[PDB]
Amino acid sequence: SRGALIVFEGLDKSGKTTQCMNIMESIPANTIKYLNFPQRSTVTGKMIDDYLTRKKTYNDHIVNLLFCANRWEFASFIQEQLEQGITLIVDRYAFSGVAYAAAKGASMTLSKSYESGLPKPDLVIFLESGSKEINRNVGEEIYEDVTFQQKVLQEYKKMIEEGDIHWQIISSEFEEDVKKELIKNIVIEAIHTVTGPVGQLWM
Amino acid sequence: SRGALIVFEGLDKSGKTTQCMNIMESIPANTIKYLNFPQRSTVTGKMIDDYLTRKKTYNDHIVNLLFCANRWEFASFIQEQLEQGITLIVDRYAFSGVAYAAAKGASMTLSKSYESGLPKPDLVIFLESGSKEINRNVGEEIYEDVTFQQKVLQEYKKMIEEGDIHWQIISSEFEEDVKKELIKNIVIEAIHTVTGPVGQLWM
Numbered sequence: 001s002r003g004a005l006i007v008f009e010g011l012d013k014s015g016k017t018t019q020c021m022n023i024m025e026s027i028p029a030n031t032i033k034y035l036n037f038p039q040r041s042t043v044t045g046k047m048i049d050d051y052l053t054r055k056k057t058y059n060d061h062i063v064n065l066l067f068c069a070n071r072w073e074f075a076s077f078i079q080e081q082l083e084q085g086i087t088l089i090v091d092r093y094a095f096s097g098v099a100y101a102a103a104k105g106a107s108m109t110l111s112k113s114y115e116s117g118l119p120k121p122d123l124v125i126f127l128e129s130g131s132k133e134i135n136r137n138v139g140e141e142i143y144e145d146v147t148f149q150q151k152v153l154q155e156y157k158k159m160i161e162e163g164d165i166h167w168q169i170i171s172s173e174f175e176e177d178v179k180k181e182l183i184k185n186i187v188i189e190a191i192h193t194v195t196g197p198v199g200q201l202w203m
Numbered sequence: 204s205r206g207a208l209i210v211f212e213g214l215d216k217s218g219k220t221t222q223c224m225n226i227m228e229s230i231p232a233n234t235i236k237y238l239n240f241p242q243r244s245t246v247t248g249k250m251i252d253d254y255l256t257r258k259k260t261y262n263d264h265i266v267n268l269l270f271c272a273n274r275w276e277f278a279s280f281i282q283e284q285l286e287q288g289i290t291l292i293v294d295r296y297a298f299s300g301v302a303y304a305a306a307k308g309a310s311m312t313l314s315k316s317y318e319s320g321l322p323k324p325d326l327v328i329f330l331e332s333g334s335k336e337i338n339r340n341v342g343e344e345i346y347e348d349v350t351f352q353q354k355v356l357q358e359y360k361k362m363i364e365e366g367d368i369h370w371q372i373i374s375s376e377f378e379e380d381v382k383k384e385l386i387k388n389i390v391i392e393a394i395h396t397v398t399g400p401v402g403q404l405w406m
């Protein structure tokens with residue numbers, strides 16, 4: 001009877017931050033914990049920040065592993081909370097890693113290997129971006145480019161189709177309040193219906 | 204008439220740090236530079252430090268690339284010094300990477316690919332560990348386990364037999380002062396007999 005590991009994925013500006021906000025308001029905080037990635041506060045965070053804000057560059061090789069290492073700092077914490085019965089709501093995760101790394105020409109099976117071992121999600125909510133959402137990308141940050149996002153999406157779809165992971169795909173076409181309600185409902189369900197040990201991702 | 208790139212390898216507790224100390228004392232310092240790996244001071248260093256001292260874990264596959272990236276920070280520096288006529292004395296290198304990564308079940312040819320491109324050594328001094336040396340491993344750090352080191356050695360031996368690299372294998376059975384003398388002698392020779400461009404490793 002652990003907490004549930006719930007992960008939000010999607011393109012930039014798909015509004016997964018908003019939806020995370022809903023869940024946090026819809027559920028009592030003594031039982032739930034919000035986790036954003038990347039965690040820009042850490043050592044690997046500040047560096048990631050410099051790269052996304054265009055005030056430093058790195059090897060494609062260096063950024064791929066900064067993001068990964070950025071997650072591993074927290075793999076202990078994640079595990080501990082779930083066991084302590086706290087449910088985790090996580091903005092971006094392993095998949096943000098692989099899809100974005102792979103979109104940049106990296107090997108999808110290799111990107112996966114690096115994540116291989118992390119706490120495995122019980123539910124992954126993917127937010128579709130329609131017209132007025134993809135074209136929300138105005139390059140204030142590094143990956144925020146319409147043509148590139150279309151490329152990430154190719155990699156996301158690929159991983160979904162591989163489903164050993166429980167995915168819930170939310171259409172772009174729902175109405176704000178209705179999307180909010182729908183998600184809120186699958187979330188609380190994920191939480192009452194959870195059992196067993198925390199899974200290990202891609203192992 | 205560059206400097207020579209000289210690399211020390213061997214199991215843990217094979218005393219390659221001692222022997223590096225000899226070379227540094229036996230040769231004038233305006234001409235020679237000592238380089239330890241891993242370079243635990245850097246960003247990838249501190250992380251490597253956390254992993255070896257058991258205060259963080261990571262994907263096997265991630266640690267593999269922490270170590271690699273840890274070497275690349277310095278590939279520029281190495282190159283520059285050799286060209287500037289300084290000889291490099293390096294504790295652990297590319298091979299520490301491959302042998303340890305491969306011992307942990309990774310692909311030997313893949314581990315190599317990641318190192319592929321680094322400055323190529325003119326001399327690689329491998330220190331054999333006998334009885335009282337292997338059994339010096341008491342697990343104060345993560346790879347310091349007798350049964351695992353026996354596995355790394357298998358991977359070292361393999362790479363030696365591939366010799367496109369100039370290796371000098373120093374027996375365990377020599378006497379301290381005599382080992383010191385012998386190494387001191389091959390080193391200064393490596394240094395007077397060096398010519399041409401710095402090689403690129405495994406390319």
Ligand SMILES: O=c1[nH]c(=O)n([C@H]2C[C@H](O)[C@@H](COP(=O)(O)O)O2)cc1/C=C/Br
Pocket residue numbers: 012013037038052063064067068092096097098100101104141143144
């Ligand atoms: O692992 C990653 N995680 C990640 O979020 N990104 C990217 C995803 C997004 O473009 C950017 C900023 O995210 P937010 O501010 O919208 O949360 O970080 C990239 C990688 C790997 C790149 Br190689």
Ligand SMILES: O=c1[nH]c(=O)n([C@H]2C[C@H](O)[C@@H](COP(=O)(O)O)O2)cc1/C=C/Br
Pocket residue numbers: 059061062268269271272275276317319320321
């Ligand atoms: O830190 C690095 N610096 C570097 O120049 N390189 C370089 C190493 C190699 O020459 C080059 C080839 O890149 P691709 O063929 O994948 O495009 O990557 C690699 C690393 C890897 C750290 Br892990």
Ligand SMILES: O=c1[nH]c(=O)n([C@H]2C[C@H](O)[C@@H](COP(=O)(O)O)O2)cc1/C=C/Br
Pocket residue numbers: 215240241255266267270271295299300301303304305307344346347
């Ligand atoms: O690339 C590597 N380089 C390396 O030095 N090591 C290892 C070799 C040794 O077990 C450990 C402790 O460092 P020392 O202070 O004794 O030099 O670092 C491991 C890898 C890859 C492992 Br996967």
Ligand SMILES: [Mg+2]
Pocket residue numbers: 012013141144
């Ligand atoms: Mg953004």
Ligand SMILES: [Mg+2]
Pocket residue numbers: 017036091
């Ligand atoms: Mg966000």
Ligand SMILES: [Mg+2]
Pocket residue numbers: 215216344
């Ligand atoms: Mg050691």
Ligand SMILES: [Mg+2]
Pocket residue numbers: 220239240294
């Ligand atoms: Mg050392």
